[PDB]
């Protein structure tokens, strides 16, 4: 009789405690966002968007190079 990572008791604690929240987000990183959203069961959207917009950082890592020398332009 344990709790899952996405137990409601834990989501509430995350709402109430920044340090607790950060620790759990640490673990949310082991999952896809799709997985997480299904787990949240349409509650705690504030947690999910905070996770997505504040805690998660995007790179500036370029991960792809296109072999096409063309570049998109728009006509008049």
């Amino acid at each position: 009789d344990l709790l899952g990572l996405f137990a409601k008791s834990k989501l509430k604690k995350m709402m109430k405690s920044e340090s607790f929240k950060l620790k759990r987000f640490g673990e949310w990183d082991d999952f896809t966002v799709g997985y997480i959203r299904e787990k949240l069961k349409n509650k705690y959207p504030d947690l999910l968007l905070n996770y997505l917009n504040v805690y998660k950082k995007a790179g500036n890592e370029i991960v792809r190079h296109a072999n096409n020398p063309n570049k998109v332009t728009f006509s008049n």
Partner: protein, 288 residues
């Protein structure tokens, strides 16, 4: 079965508001198109020149206007971005023609999955009823099985990424689209859902919960970051009615193309198509 397929095209190439095909013919288009979709990858790798259309929503006569403007296949190549059915009066003519041209010119003619090529949606927003009333519900399931195989995105000269909806918080590398398992329904959440459902937002930065009730909004920040990270120049998507038929987002790093003029006889919007030439110069043909 190339003789059958051209008679089918010929006959569909005619206006009206009644059936002209048999159930068995429509069944055949669905079988053969399905096999064609499954041969080709789920992330399409296309070359310009090519003409790109957004939502049609059963507005068959407008679909014919678009082929007028652009040239009937294979005079031009086409990529459609989904939403062939629902809301309009003539979804069947619309999808049957599109599937016929896919089978006919498979290297020159392409169709992506829209969020309306999904049973739980087109159940409700008209297609199921159009099927029942003009044929039967069995023909609806046949389309469903076909739609479940529709490819999901397309990359044009490796620089323009096209999908019906938008970006995903789970879209970290493009090969993830290639790896999406095909005969599928659209799940409630996750990559495939977001590719068909997400929207750009001018009002909300980053990721926001989509008001539609599934998936997300993404801000101009997400677009900028995504194009920089994946060395892309443009995102081309549909899914939203826009007054002028096309509409730029995030310093023109994204464009929304909606091809159904005067949607539902109500919106008074223009429809658009985007032509991409060999140099990736993009231009827009408008329908009012």
């Amino acid at each position: 079965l190339d003789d059958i397929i051209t008679r089918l095209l010929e006959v569909k190439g005619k206006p009206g508001k009644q059936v002209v095909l048999t159930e068995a013919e429509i069944k055949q288009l669905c079988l053969v198109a399905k096999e064609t979709f499954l041969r080709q990858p789920n992330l399409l790798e296309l070359e310009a020149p090519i003409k790109i259309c957004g939502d049609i929503h059963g507005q068959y006569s407008d679909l014919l206007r678009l082929f007028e403007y652009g040239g009937l296949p294979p005079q031009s190549n086409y990529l459609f971005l989904g939403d062939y059915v629902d809301r309009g009066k003539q979804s069947l003519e619309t999808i049957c023609l599109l599937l016929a041209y896919k089978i006919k010119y498979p290297e020159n003619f392409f169709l992506l999955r829209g969020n309306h090529e999904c049973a739980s949606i087109n159940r409700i927003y008209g297609f199921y009823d159009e099927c029942k009333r003009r044929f039967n519900v069995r023909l609806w399931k046949i389309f469903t099985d076909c739609f479940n195989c529709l490819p999901v995105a397309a990359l044009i000269d490796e620089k323009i990424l096209c999908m019906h909806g938008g970006l995903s918080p789970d879209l970290n590398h493009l090969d993830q689209i290639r790896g999406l398992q095909r005969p599928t329904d659209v799940p409630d959440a996750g990559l495939l859902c977001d590719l068909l459902w997400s929207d750009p937002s001018k009002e909300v930065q980053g990721w926001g919960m989509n008001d539609r009730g599934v998936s997300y909004t993404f801000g101009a920040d997400k677009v900028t970051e995504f194009l920089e990270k994946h060395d892309l120049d443009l995102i081309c998507r549909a899914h939203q009615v826009v007054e002028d038929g096309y509409e730029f987002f995030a310093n023109r790093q994204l464009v929304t193309v909606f091809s159904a003029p005067n949607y539902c006889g109500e919106f008074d919007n223009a429809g658009a198509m985007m032509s991409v030439d060999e140099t990736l110069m993009c231009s827009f043909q408008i329908l009012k």
